[PDB]
Motif scaffolding. Structure first.
Motif, PDB file in Angstrom:
ATOM      1  N   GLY A 128      30.218 105.078  98.013  1.00  0.00           N
ATOM      2  CA  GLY A 128      30.496 106.465  98.333  1.00  0.00           C
ATOM      3  C   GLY A 128      29.320 107.372  98.044  1.00  0.00           C
ATOM      4  N   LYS A 129      28.382 106.883  97.241  1.00  0.00           N
ATOM      5  CA  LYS A 129      27.169 107.607  96.887  1.00  0.00           C
ATOM      6  C   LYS A 129      25.992 106.971  97.609  1.00  0.00           C
ATOM      7  N   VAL A 130      25.157 107.797  98.231  1.00  0.00           N
ATOM      8  CA  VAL A 130      24.023 107.322  99.010  1.00  0.00           C
ATOM      9  C   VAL A 130      22.769 108.048  98.545  1.00  0.00           C
ATOM     10  N   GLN A 131      21.664 107.314  98.467  1.00  0.00           N
ATOM     11  CA  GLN A 131      20.367 107.876  98.112  1.00  0.00           C
ATOM     12  C   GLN A 131      19.668 108.337  99.383  1.00  0.00           C
ATOM     13  N   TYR A 132      19.366 109.628  99.462  1.00  0.00           N
ATOM     14  CA  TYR A 132      18.729 110.163 100.651  1.00  0.00           C
ATOM     15  C   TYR A 132      17.224 109.929 100.604  1.00  0.00           C
ATOM     16  N   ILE A 173      18.459 119.451 102.437  1.00  0.00           N
ATOM     17  CA  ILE A 173      19.699 119.361 101.686  1.00  0.00           C
ATOM     18  C   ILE A 173      19.619 120.103 100.361  1.00  0.00           C
ATOM     19  N   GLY A 174      18.504 119.978  99.645  1.00  0.00           N
ATOM     20  CA  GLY A 174      18.429 120.478  98.293  1.00  0.00           C
ATOM     21  C   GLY A 174      18.862 119.484  97.243  1.00  0.00           C
ATOM     22  N   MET A 175      19.358 118.321  97.654  1.00  0.00           N
ATOM     23  CA  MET A 175      19.738 117.248  96.753  1.00  0.00           C
ATOM     24  C   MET A 175      19.116 115.950  97.243  1.00  0.00           C
ATOM     25  N   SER A 198      25.727 119.483 105.291  1.00  0.00           N
ATOM     26  CA  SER A 198      24.595 120.345 104.998  1.00  0.00           C
ATOM     27  C   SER A 198      23.591 120.332 106.141  1.00  0.00           C
ATOM     28  N   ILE A 199      23.460 119.209 106.855  1.00  0.00           N
ATOM     29  CA  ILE A 199      22.589 119.215 108.026  1.00  0.00           C
ATOM     30  C   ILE A 199      23.138 120.156 109.086  1.00  0.00           C
ATOM     31  N   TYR A 200      24.459 120.148 109.296  1.00  0.00           N
ATOM     32  CA  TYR A 200      25.012 121.078 110.273  1.00  0.00           C
ATOM     33  C   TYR A 200      24.815 122.518 109.816  1.00  0.00           C
ATOM     34  N   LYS A 201      24.974 122.769 108.515  1.00  0.00           N
ATOM     35  CA  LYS A 201      24.780 124.119 108.002  1.00  0.00           C
ATOM     36  C   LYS A 201      23.344 124.578 108.208  1.00  0.00           C
ATOM     37  N   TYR A 202      22.384 123.658 108.088  1.00  0.00           N
ATOM     38  CA  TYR A 202      20.998 124.027 108.348  1.00  0.00           C
ATOM     39  C   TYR A 202      20.758 124.273 109.828  1.00  0.00           C
TER      40      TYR A 202
END
Lengths: 212, 48
Positions: free
Chosen positions: A59-63, A71-73, A84-88
């Motif tokens: 469920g956790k992925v390293q970007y 993203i900021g994370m 967050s990509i859509y928000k950008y």
């Protein structure tokens, strides 16, 4: 689409009984309407909405260090990534309404087309990372039909009190017109259709057939 | 000796219901037995 079943689900609960002889029928109508309002509040909270992960083992992925600039994370679920990509893509007013790709998107997508549909954008995003109630509803619909039967027998005998001359002649005509229907299929039974007793309107029929 | 309007009116009426001048040939319609079964029929007429 709702699945058809083989048993009656509901009954009309008739209302031609005199409301001054049988009592508490309006109590039943009030109880049924109240149960009809006690589940419209449940089905609503079954479609309940919840906002629990705007930002906040598989469920956790390293970007990647590239997508970490939109993203900021650097870690988080895939939902946070696509959201967050859509928000950008939305904040910077990039959609063509007069998606037009930005400068940093060129790097994060490794594409120089400067214009790409949103479908391909999220494609690259992926590229980077209960029984008893049936018995109760059959038991109740098995009593509203017994009620719907006794009410019909009351309706018949009450409509027999008033105008008995009209009901009796109808009963005698229904009888003389239904005992004939039931005695129309006793001619074909495979033990009286090969003994040559019914072949001596089965003679004009062969005339019509031969002509046909 | 009736007036022409009535003669043509009653003639078109009779031809409408196919009572007279009915275009028909009996070589294309087969025979059949009616609901009335075989019996013994008579037509009573007044004395002339």
């Amino acid at each position: 689409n709702p699945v058809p079943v083989t048993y009656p689900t509901d009954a009309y609960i008739p209302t031609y009984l005199p409301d001054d002889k049988v009592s508490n029928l309006a109590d039943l109508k009030k109880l049924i309407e109240m149960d009809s309002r006690l589940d419209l509040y449940l089905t609503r909270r079954r479609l309940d909405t919840s906002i629990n992960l705007p930002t906040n083992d598989g469920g956790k992925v390293q970007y990647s260090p590239n997508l970490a600039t939109l993203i900021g994370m650097q870690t988080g679920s895939v939902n946070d990534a696509v959201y967050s990509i859509y928000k950008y893509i939305l904040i910077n007013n990039l959609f063509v309404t007069e998606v037009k790709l930005d400068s940093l998107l060129q790097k994060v997508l490794d594409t120089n087309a400067a214009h790409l549909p949103l479908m391909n954008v999220v494609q690259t995003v992926n590229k980077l990372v209960d029984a008893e109630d049936t018995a109760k509803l059959r038991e109740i619909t098995k009593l509203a039909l017994q009620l719907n039967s006794s009410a019909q027998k009351y309706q018949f005998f009450h409509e027999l009190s008033l105008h008995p001359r009209e009901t009796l002649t109808h009963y005698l005509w229904s009888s003389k017109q239904n005992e004939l229907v039931l005695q129309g299929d006793q001619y074909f039974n495979e033990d009286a259709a090969r003994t040559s007793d019914i072949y001596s309107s089965l003679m004009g029929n062969i005339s019509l057939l031969y002509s046909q | 000796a009736m007036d022409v309007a009535s003669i043509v009116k009653i003639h078109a009426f009779l031809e409408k219901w196919g009572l007279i001048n009915y275009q028909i040939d009996p070589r294309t319609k087969p025979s059949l037995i009616g609901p009335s079964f075989t019996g013994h029929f008579q037509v009573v007429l007044d004395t002339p």
